[PDB]
Amino acid sequence: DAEFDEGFKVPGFLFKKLFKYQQTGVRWLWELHCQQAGGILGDEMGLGKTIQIIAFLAGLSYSKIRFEGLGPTVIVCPTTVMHQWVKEFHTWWPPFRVAILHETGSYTHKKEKLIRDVAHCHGILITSYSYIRLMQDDISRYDWHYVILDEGHKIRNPNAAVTLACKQFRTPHRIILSGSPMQNNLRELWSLFDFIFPGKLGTLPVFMEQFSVPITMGGYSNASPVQVKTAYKCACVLRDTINPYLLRRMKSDVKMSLSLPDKNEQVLFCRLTDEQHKVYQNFVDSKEVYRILNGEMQIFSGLIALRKICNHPDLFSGEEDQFGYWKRSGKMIVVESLLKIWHKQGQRVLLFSQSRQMLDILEVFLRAQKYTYLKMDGTTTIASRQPLITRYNEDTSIFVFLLTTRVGGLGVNLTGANRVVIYDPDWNPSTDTQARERAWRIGQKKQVTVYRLLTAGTIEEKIYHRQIFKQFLTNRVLKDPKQRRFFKSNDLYELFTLTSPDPLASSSLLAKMRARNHL
Amino acid sequence: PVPPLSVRPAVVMQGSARNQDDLTHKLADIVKINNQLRRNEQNGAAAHVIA
DNA sequence: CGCTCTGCTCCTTCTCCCATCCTCTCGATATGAGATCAACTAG
DNA sequence: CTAGTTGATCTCATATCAGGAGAAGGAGCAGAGCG
Ligand SMILES: [Mg+2]
Numbered sequence A: 001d002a003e004f005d006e007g008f009k010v011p012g013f014l015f016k017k018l019f020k021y022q023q024t025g026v027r028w029l030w031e032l033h034c035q036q037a038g039g040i041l042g043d044e045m046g047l048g049k050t051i052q053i054i055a056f057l058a059g060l061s062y063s064k065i066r067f068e069g070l071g072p073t074v075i076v077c078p079t080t081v082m083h084q085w086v087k088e089f090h091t092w093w094p095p096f097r098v099a100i101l102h103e104t105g106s107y108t109h110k111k112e113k114l115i116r117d118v119a120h121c122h123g124i125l126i127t128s129y130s131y132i133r134l135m136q137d138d139i140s141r142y143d144w145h146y147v148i149l150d151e152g153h154k155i156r157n158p159n160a161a162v163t164l165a166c167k168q169f170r171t172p173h174r175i176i177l178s179g180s181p182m183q184n185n186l187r188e189l190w191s192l193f194d195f196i197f198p199g200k201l202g203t204l205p206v207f208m209e210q211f212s213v214p215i216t217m218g219g220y221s222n223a224s225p226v227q228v229k230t231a232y233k234c235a236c237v238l239r240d241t242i243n244p245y246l247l248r249r250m251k252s253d254v255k256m257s258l259s260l261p262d263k264n265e266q267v268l269f270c271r272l273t274d275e276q277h278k279v280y281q282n283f284v285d286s287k288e289v290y291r292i293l294n295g296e297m298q299i300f301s302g303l304i305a306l307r308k309i310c311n312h313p314d315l316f317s318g319e320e321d322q323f324g325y326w327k328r329s330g331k332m333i334v335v336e337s338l339l340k341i342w343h344k345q346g347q348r349v350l351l352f353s354q355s356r357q358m359l360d361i362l363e364v365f366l367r368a369q370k371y372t373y374l375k376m377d378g379t380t381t382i383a384s385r386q387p388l389i390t391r392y393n394e395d396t397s398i399f400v401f402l403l404t405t406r407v408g409g410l411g412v413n414l415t416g417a418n419r420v421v422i423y424d425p426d427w428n429p430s431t432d433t434q435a436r437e438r439a440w441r442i443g444q445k446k447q448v449t450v451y452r453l454l455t456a457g458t459i460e461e462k463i464y465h466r467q468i469f470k471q472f473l474t475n476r477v478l479k480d481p482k483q484r485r486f487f488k489s490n491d492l493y494e495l496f497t498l499t500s501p502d503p504l505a506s507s508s509l510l511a512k513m514r515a516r517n518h519l
Numbered sequence B: 001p002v003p004p005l006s007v008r009p010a011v012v013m014q015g016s017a018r019n020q021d022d023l024t025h026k027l028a029d030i031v032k033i034n035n036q037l038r039r040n041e042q043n044g045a046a047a048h049v050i051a
Numbered sequence C: 001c002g003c004t005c006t007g008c009t010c011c012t013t014c015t016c017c018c019a020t021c022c023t024c025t026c027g028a029t030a031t032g033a034g035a036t037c038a039a040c041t042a043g
Numbered sequence D: 001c002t003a004g005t006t007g008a009t010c011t012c013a014t015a016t017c018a019g020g021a022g023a024a025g026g027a028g029c030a031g032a033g034c035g
Helices: A012-017 A020-035 A050-062 A079-092 A111-121 A129-134 A161-166 A186-196 A204-217 A225-242 A274-284 A287-293 A300-311 A330-344 A356-368 A382-394 A429-437 A459-478 A508-518 B022-042
Strands: A039-041 A073-076 A098-101 A124-127 A175-177 A349-353 A373-376 A400-404 A419-422 A448-452
Touching: A012 A050, A020 A039, A020 A050, A039 A186, A050 A079, A050 A175, A079 A098, A079 A124, A079 A382, A098 A111, A111 A124, A129 A161, A161 A186, A175 A186, A186 A204, A186 A225, A186 A459, A204 A225, A204 A459, A225 A459, A225 A508, A274 A287, A274 A300, A287 A300, A300 A356, A300 A459, A330 A349, A330 A356, A330 A419, A349 A356, A356 A373, A356 A400, A373 A382, A419 A429, A429 A448, A429 A459
Parallel strands: A039 A175, A073 A124, A098 A124, A349 A400, A349 A419, A373 A400, A419 A448
Antiparallel strands: none
């Protein structure tokens, strides 16, 4: 057995399975427990965070450290991964009672009875974020011990009802599992750190004034050098502030110690077809976009219309001229070529989409070919989602796995897939990141590559630029503060244009004080 | 109290966009400020902005 | 004789009001994904 | 009983001088009256 500082023992057989970084994470989690503080397991997608949590909880109950050992814990996760958590708990620590609070569930009686039973039995209640919002009256009356939030970046909006619900738990032991705990700006980081440890980053106004405006405003292309140094100063301050409670391991410092196969992250710049280009040019020349640029109307109509046009001209639905015909969209032509090549190479492909309608169009195109597909979007019943994933992970007869990035991403394991193609960019970089890490995970025995399709000179390239800027802003505070300024664009409201190509002894402390001011 | 629509009728004008009564716009402002204030209570906020 | 209790005029604020009825012209004035639930819609 | 399909509904997320008149309050002074 592994013996930690005070009284925490994790069983030897369980400990041996864990990797070096995973047991380092268990150590860190128990140091947080000693401090009675929350934390973020920021390890990227696929590095293993369900296993670290399961091992830490198993050692906490095993070690016998109100609550004797482990109390009644609640795990809030996306609906598609609830049964995944159940399976991992059963395989790794079968002694735990692990009930699902969901319509699928296993209880077949009043839910409130299930919450009461798990609370009074010191079991693990896995629930969804929607249920936490809905059952906040009952979920918080029972003095839970641990409130692990899997994919806790769903709490990123400080004013969302789910966030306010999840911030009602009285316990100090609040954990977030999310390999991307910053997706659009630093408000998200503040929301997460308000959840795990309400005090460190102060009130949201104060956090804005001290960190968000300095750090963000120093990343713009026109930033003055003094402002860049101020942003550096603030980013370093914030990194030091959030260091003890963020544990973020990359797949670069762990890849050598984990034997993952090679990865590629190509970004194809697809070409609008003549008809697609015509529709795009007609729309950017229309009066609606003119009204948008004048501030009269909301930008959403034009933005969504351009995204649809780049996806496929489903605005004006033009035999072999049915709705969604592949040859009318350039990205669909590229996807057809890629699918042909990969099928002749005997490989398995993971085809993502932001839009459900574009997913239906891709599904129709796949039946048009002889490819054997398998689809999972928000409409599929939750109870069948983990089965479906297992199916695609089990038999290699299934060639392509269609997905929406909101359901197909976000914590599922699809290591059976070999190639991954992100068909449509999103405004949030993190959606695309999780979608592309669905394949390159622990258990991937083959070389994976990511093909991220963008239409050249369209709104999609501008979205790619916006999310590159967001990723740079995130890296400025997650990996290093020396981040190069985003210079590719100014990120203004001219994304409506078509531009198709072709003890310290008071001296080290005083030195740090002197150096920081100089910055 | 929110008066009914007959007290603040909304008339379909020549332009298809509906026309709202003055009371309706005032009520919209009241709802906006009330919602913002209620937001600033469920999550704590400085007394200055609340005032 | 100190201290209070009116109280007296007076200046300040403030709020209200300002005929009835009729005619005409003229200017200004989003969209989809996911979740929940409830009705089926059948097995 | 009992799972799968169908609609409604909610949340959430994607960028960039030429009035006047009267009534109510407060102010300062003046005195009366009693400890
Ligand atoms: Mg996970």
